[PDB]
Amino acid sequence: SETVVTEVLGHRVTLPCLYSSWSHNSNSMCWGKDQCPYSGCKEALIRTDGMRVTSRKSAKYRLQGTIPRGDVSLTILNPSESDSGVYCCRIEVPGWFNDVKINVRLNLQRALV
Ligand SMILES: [Ca+2]
């Protein structure tokens, strides 16, 4: 189950991810490219605890919504062709075998002419 986002041709683009029951005392999440990151959320594009981003692969990735409300959509600055493809938003939920995996396919194109 994925949401498809289409953008032609570039300055910034947001990939939706919402987890409305989010609690700052329980939740954290991360984003990954091509595949969902593993439990624990290491080596990811960007990652949060219950309140805020705590690391990212580069400045190209932002989270602008309220993280304590589960607005964890990824903003990608200056996106380009290689930014296309599958992305996965992994919600970390207490317990095992219960993390939520949300997929967005980003179609980043240019005008045809
Ligand atoms: Ca879990």
Swiss-Prot record:
Highest taxon, organism lineage: Eukaryota
Name this protein carries in UniProt: T-cell immunoglobulin and mucin domain-containing protein 4
Covalent S-S links between cysteines: C17-C89, C30-C41, C36-C88
Similarity section: Belongs to the immunoglobulin superfamily. TIM family.
Subcellular localization: Cell membrane; Secreted, Extracellular exosome
One GO BP: apoptotic cell clearance
Functional note: Phosphatidylserine receptor that plays different role in immune response including phagocytosis of apoptotic cells and T-cell regulation. Controls T-cell activation in a bimodal fashion, decreasing the activation of naive T-cells by inducing cell cycle arrest, while increasing proliferation of activated T-cells by activating AKT1 and ERK1/2 phosphorylations and subsequent signaling pathways. Also plays a role in efferocytosis which is the process by which apoptotic cells are removed by phagocytic cells.
Gene Ontology cellular-component terms listed: extracellular region; plasma membrane
Keywords: Cell membrane, Disulfide bond, Glycoprotein, Immunoglobulin domain, Membrane, Phosphoprotein, Secreted, Signal, Transmembrane, Transmembrane helix
Assembly behavior: Interacts with MERTK; this interaction enhances TIMD4-mediated efferocytosis. Interacts with EPHA2.
Domain comment, as recorded: Recognizes phosphatidyl serine via its immunoglobulin domain.
Main subcellular location of this protein, as a coarse class: membrane
Domain Ig-like V-type: start-end pairs: 2-103
Magnesium is among the record's keywords: no
Gene Ontology MF term list: phosphatidylserine binding
